[PDB]
């Protein structure tokens with residue numbers, strides 16, 4: 001073993017997520033943060049080249065979480081799914097833990 005997840009940053013601002021992730025070397029380095037613009041919703045921020053991409057974590061009626069189509073009972077299961085299935089529809093971008 002039990003360690004906390006290296007990817008949960010709570011209420012950091014979108015810009016602070018960009019600032020942090022831009023220093024990461026490896027595409028797919030990522031975090032989950034609690035949106036300021038949409039309180040009570042999560043956002044996923046991900047290093048890609050000289051950019052950081054942001055995705056809304058969406059919810060169905062039952063409160064399951066998804067980015068596109070496949071949905072999960074927890075943020076943890078959605079994150080893990082997207083380590084081996086791209087988060088993006090325009091590039092192959094697979095979630096990988098930040099270096100720390």
Ligand SMILES: [Cl-]
Nearest residue numbers: 084085086092
């Ligand atoms: Cl894929």
